[PDB]
Amino acid sequence: GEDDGDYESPNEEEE
Amino acid sequence: GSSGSSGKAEAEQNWWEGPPQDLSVHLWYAGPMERAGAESILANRSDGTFLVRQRVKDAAEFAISIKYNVEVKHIKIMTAEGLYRITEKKAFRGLTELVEFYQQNSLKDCFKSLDTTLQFPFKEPEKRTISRSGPSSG
């Protein structure tokens, strides 16, 4: 799809 | 696919002739090396090692791979008109700065997962809190 999170993800909780 | 071929790429051969400016200058460098190639590096080395690798998709793409939590982590670095940033909130001007910056700012800020910052590069770390400030530059 469009989204791609192959690497680590940044602060999610923190909008 | 959902698979990962096996490889070691173990071979010490330097057939170069005085290469010009290149990431090499930095105490940390990583060519097109694959995942395993990076993991092993940060896996065998001391806990907290890191380096700078480039992606194949876009020549102008870097990634910071560091070993932590009994596992090797990696980050995708962006590039805008000669820029460098891994987050939308934060943004840098050069790759070097982004690296020499994390060493002071725990990646935990952005990557809550990684509760650690660049401890040691690929070649060798620094000493005597050596750093180069950027006067009216950047």
- Alpha carbon separation from A6 to A3, B30, B63, B71 (Å, rounded): 10, 19, 12, 15
Q: Chain B: nearest CA to A5, how far in angstroms?
A: 9
- Angle B56-B39-B17 (CA atoms, 0-180°, nearest 5)? 60
- Listing DSSP states for B10-47 in one string gives -------SS--S-GGGSS--B-S--HHHHHHHHHHS-T
CB atoms within 10 A of CB A3: 4
Q: Which among B44, B20, B41 has a CA at the least distance from the CA of B29?
A: B41
Q: Specify whether the CB–CB gap between B110 and B102 falls below 8 A.
A: no
DSSP class of residue B70 equals T
| Contact assignment for B74 to A9 by CB distance below 8 Å | no
> Measured between alpha carbons, how far is B89 from B80 in angstroms, rounded to an integer?
14
Burial readout B75-102 (b: 16 or more C-beta within 10 A, e: otherwise): bbbbeeeeebebeeeeebeebbebbbeb
CA B72 to chain centre: 12
Chain A residue with CA closest to B90: the answer is A10
- Angle B133-B114-B127 (CA atoms, 0-180°, nearest 5)? 35
**How would you class B52 by CB atoms within 10 Å of its CB: exposed for 0-12, middle for 13-18, buried for 19 or more?**
buried
User: What's chain B's length in residues?
Assistant: 138
> Measured between alpha carbons, how far is B92 from B104 in angstroms, rounded to an integer?
15
| Contact assignment for B63 to A11 by CB distance below 8 Å | no
Q: Which among B101, B55, B97 has a CA at the least distance from the CA of B78?
A: B55
Domains of chain B: 1-138 (3.30.505.10)
